[PDB]
Design a protein around this ligand. Structure first.
Ligand SMILES: *[C@@H]1O[C@H](CO)[C@@H](O)[C@H](O)[C@H]1NC(C)=O
Ligand SMILES: *[C@@H]1O[C@H](CO)[C@@H](O)[C@H](O)[C@H]1NC(C)=O
Ligand SMILES: *[C@@H]1O[C@H](CO)[C@@H](O)[C@H](O)[C@H]1NC(C)=O
Ligand SMILES: *[C@@H]1O[C@H](CO)[C@@H](O)[C@H](O)[C@H]1NC(C)=O
Ligand SMILES: *[C@@H]1O[C@H](CO)[C@@H](O)[C@H](O)[C@H]1NC(C)=O
Ligand SMILES: *[C@@H]1O[C@H](CO)[C@@H](O)[C@H](O)[C@H]1NC(C)=O
Ligand SMILES: [Ca+2]
Ligand SMILES: [Ca+2]
Lengths: 293, 293
């Protein structure tokens, strides 16, 4: 996967066509001077813009996109449908033909819906799946067949969440699906490999959080950790790895000391901690662990 | 002050009489071998016991005490009434003759009363004073005249709190009083000098706390900090000082790196942070700051 955010704001792959099948080619960001977004607006490379025509998401839209025309008379930019840009725990964009819905546990509507407010709702009620539709509608369930009506292109799930216009909240007859583990404040992991996100992900992390996750893989000689996303604002915001047996703090990362791409810990049992101050919020993190025997 | 706990478990002064007026002399802990508490039980000096007859509180009682007889036939130990052993924010032990009570805001009873559960109740309702009586009764108020019926000896407020037998919860017609700032999860200080305690103090700090307190004294060239009490259990429990203007972390202290007796920060504006993991609890801290012009 090349995205660990819900809107692919961290995408830096090389897709330069709005779609791999029947797509249009992107314009180069170092040529897009009619347009708001270009390399003269963002020197320093902000948003991943540069001397390329790769799909990017610099303006906090719901998904990577690119310019497809030089003059903005008609349709001049388009979302990119990038297969590898699907955060782990986003199960995809699915069709919802009405009766029954794809998720049959419970549901609500909110004028402030976000991805997490929906996830959080579902999780609280002990459902494994949460699905956003039409920007404002949250459905929850344990039905395995949330795909009952079929997959859709990710771009048909790009209505803005009514409570956060940086996030995708499905569409008309379209439901974007998430594992309710996503953004949980704690959890226990024993898969060989998985991803753990900050609390409230993909919303920004709330203030005053203390959260931990156990990672425990019987047999493992080591666990390799990488931080494909690390957007932690404050010095007093912290991500910590503990030895699971001894509780010793193996590494501390904060807003002024970032993690390596990656590192190894030779334990089979680790505790990830996150602490959030009451000052500034940010997108948070995604940690990917792969255990090795 | 020589105590920064509610039960004087941190008292290490030299009072060796149950009271300074009309008192009895304490027995030496290196002679008290009939008794449970003595230097052979606690080598390593645990509880402040040693080759002395000073009042101490090693057994998590409600107040310092000492042995007054060698054979435990009748009355063989007694609480010490130590004037300097009164934590800041404990306003003292007062008489309550019934009608009206000394605090007239509101009140409750609880089979689990602690000092903090009472304080917390009162604070929540916006009262400045909280008063425990008879072990189970909490009164709150803003009345300045909580001393209306007079002061009592601190030892007449030594009924165990029904919810924590290490703590004093007043007596029959006796009310022990506390400022509701004590153990608050945050607050703003501008006094020249004051004390700030961990959250939930004098109860042990709860899990998952993130708390900050501002200390801000217009004019100050520096603030001297000292840590007369620091009982923080875990490496992942933390106390941090921030520069108030820049939010830079000036010092981090945790369960495996304790603060100096004392140190100076040359700012007039500092933020104290506390972070509690979800593993082990302990008594917490008391920080005393004195600002200097
Ligand atoms: C897409 O990008 C690659 C460089 O990574 C380049 O070879 C190719 O010409 C680009 N395609 C278009 C249609 O601009
Ligand atoms: C933009 O940069 C690309 C890659 O260096 C280059 O091929 C293209 O001609 C440039 N266009 C402009 C207007 O600078
Ligand atoms: C971590 O372990 C892997 C095998 O899982 C090894 O190939 C790699 O070199 C190690 N990484 C580091 C940064 O030491
Ligand atoms: C009290 O302690 C002091 C030593 O600090 C000693 O001089 C004195 O004799 C003690 N008093 C009694 C009555 O044991
Ligand atoms: C206990 O220690 C004190 C101070 O050293 C000493 O005066 C006293 O005689 C000792 N008593 C015993 C039984 O050791
Ligand atoms: C801190 O400041 C005081 C004056 O408030 C000074 O006398 C003292 O030596 C300083 N303490 C330290 C540890 O530097
Ligand atoms: Ca923060
Ligand atoms: Ca702890």
């Amino acid at each position: 996967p090349e995205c660990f955010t819900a809107n692919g704001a961290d995408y830096r792959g090389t897709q330069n066509w709005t779609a791999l099948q029947g797509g249009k080619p992107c314009l180069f960001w170092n040529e897009t001077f009619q347009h708001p977004y270009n390399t003269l607006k963002y020197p320093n490379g902000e948003g991943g813009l540069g001397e390329h025509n790769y799909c990017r998401n610099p303006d906090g839209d719901v998904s990577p996109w690119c310019y497809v025309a030089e003059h903005e008379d008609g349709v001049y930019w388009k979302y990119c449908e990038i297969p590898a840009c699907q955060m782990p725990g986003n199960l995809g964009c699915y069709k919802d033909h009405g009766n029954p819905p794809p998720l049959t546990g419970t549901s609500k509507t909110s004028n402030k819906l976000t991805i997490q407010t929906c996830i959080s709702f579902c999780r609280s009620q002990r459902f494994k799946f949460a699905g956003m539709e039409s920007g404002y509608a949250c459905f929850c369930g344990n039905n395995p067949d949330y795909w009952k009506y079929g997959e859709a292109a990710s771009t048909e799930c790009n209505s803005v969440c009514f409570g956060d216009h940086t996030q995708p909240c499905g569409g008309d007859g379209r439901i974007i699906l998430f594992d309710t583990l996503v953004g949980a404040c704690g959890g226990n992991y024993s898969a060989m490999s998985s991803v753990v996100y900050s609390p409230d992900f993909p919303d920004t992390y709330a203030t005053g959080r203390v959260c931990y996750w156990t990672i425990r893989v019987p047999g493992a000689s080591h666990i390799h950790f990488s931080f494909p996303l690390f957007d932690i604002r404050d010095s007093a915001d912290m991500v910590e790895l503990l030895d699971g047996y001894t509780h010793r703090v193996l590494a501390r990362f904060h807003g002024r000391s970032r993690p390596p791409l990656s590192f190894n810990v030779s334990l089979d049992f680790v505790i990830l901690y996150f602490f959030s101050d009451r000052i500034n919020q940010a997108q948070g993190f995604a940690v990917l662990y792969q255990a090795v025997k």
